[PDB]
């Protein structure tokens, strides 16, 4: 990984030590990016619902993961499952149980810094993985992209700024998650998020992290080329809100 400071350094060190799983996959790879394109063609708003027991954002919600997943199966384009343990209270067992319970695409959201974590995602039933430009050297990012692609996954590449985008495009990203998160305030910079979206080629599938969980924001972004939306706290708090977001 890159050399880091603070809690990202900590979580990367934890991740490097994470024991791998041994399990045979007995679930198809259900492509998230393709399902998003399908929703776009059908004019159905495509929302990727997070399951996250905790978040550094103040998030502290206990709710049954299977009940949540089965509810979202009806509405969401896919699920994003936090599997990082220390800051998000995630677990591989929770991912496995969720994957064994629904047949919509599942993104394993963690801090992937070694190949065996991609093996873990595959073996546990996830359909793809998050890769984070800001924690990986360029060579690592390219290699891990290729390694995920070796399983038939297309990873979601997380960018937070223009430097991350330059790297992501150079290494061949085709599925990009645009955050533009400030870690002091914990707020999405909407202006910058929009600038980044405008800089992405038309042949990249684009997912925006939503801070403001409202229909009008979705409509503006969709107009600007965004294909799908990641939404976390508001859906963990009130799952049924997704219905009003998709109309
Ligand atoms: C989960 C709700 C968000 C998450 O897992 C995550 C990971 C890494 C990351 C890096 C950023 O900048 C480099 C911004 C946001 C973010 C969110
Ligand atoms: C999504 C609207 C917020 C999100 O993904 C996120 C991820 C990680 C993170 C870390 C923080 O501490 C450094 C603060 C906020 C925050 C928000």
Swiss-Prot record:
EC primary class: lyase
Return one Gene Ontology term, BP aspect. Answer: L-tryptophan biosynthetic process
Show the CDD domains listed in the entry. IGPS
Q: From the Swiss-Prot or TrEMBL record, what is one GO molecular function term? A: indole-3-glycerol-phosphate synthase activity
Q: Which InterPro entries match?
A: Aldolase_TIM (IPR013785), Indole-3-glycerol_P_synth (IPR045186), Indole-3-glycerol_P_synth_dom (IPR013798), Indole-3-GlycerolPSynthase_CS (IPR001468), RibuloseP-bd_barrel (IPR011060)
Pathway annotation from the record: Amino-acid biosynthesis; L-tryptophan biosynthesis; L-tryptophan from chorismate: step 4/5
Keyword annotations of the record: Amino-acid biosynthesis, Aromatic amino acid biosynthesis, Decarboxylase, Lyase, Tryptophan biosynthesis
- SUPFAM superfamilies listed in its UniProt record: Ribulose-phoshate binding barrel
**EC assignment:** 4.1.1.48
Annotated catalysed reactions: 1-(2-carboxyphenylamino)-1-deoxy-D-ribulose 5-phosphate + H(+) = (1S,2R)-1-C-(indol-3-yl)glycerol 3-phosphate + CO2 + H2O
State the similarity comment. Belongs to the TrpC family.
Describe the subunit structure: Monomer.
Q: Spell out the protein name for this chain.
A: Indole-3-glycerol phosphate synthase
């Amino acid at each position: 990984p890159r050399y880091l400071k603070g809690w990202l350094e900590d979580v990367v060190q934890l991740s490097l030590r994470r024991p791998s799983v041994r399990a045979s996959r007995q679930r198809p790879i259900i492509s998230l990016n393709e399902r998003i394109l399908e929703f776009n063609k059908r004019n159905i708003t495509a929302i990727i619902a997070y399951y996250s027991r905790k978040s550094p954002s103040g998030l502290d919600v206990e709710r049954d993961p299977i009940e949540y997943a089965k509810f979202m199966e009806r509405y969401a384009v896919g699920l994003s499952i936090k599997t990082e343990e220390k800051y998000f209270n995630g677990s591989y067992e929770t991912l496995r149980k969720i994957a064994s319970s629904v047949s919509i695409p599942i993104l394993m959201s963690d801090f992937i810094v070694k190949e065996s974590q991609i093996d873990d995602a595959y073996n546990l039933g996830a359909d793809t993985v998050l890769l984070i430009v800001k924690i990986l050297t360029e060579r690592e990012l390219e290699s891990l992209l290729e390694y995920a692609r070796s399983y038939g996954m297309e990873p979601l590449i997380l960018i937070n700024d223009e430097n991350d985008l330059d790297i992501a495009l150079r290494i061949g990203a085709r599925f990009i998650g645009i955050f533009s998160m400030n870690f002091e305030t914990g707020e999405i910079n909407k202006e910058n998020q929009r600038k980044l979206i405008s800089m992405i080629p038309s042949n990249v599938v684009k997912v925006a992290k939503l801070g403001i969980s409202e229909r009008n924001e979705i409509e503006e972004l969709r107009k600007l080329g965004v294909n799908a939306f990641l939404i976390s706290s508001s859906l963990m708090r009130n799952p049924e809100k997704i219905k009003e977001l998709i109309e």
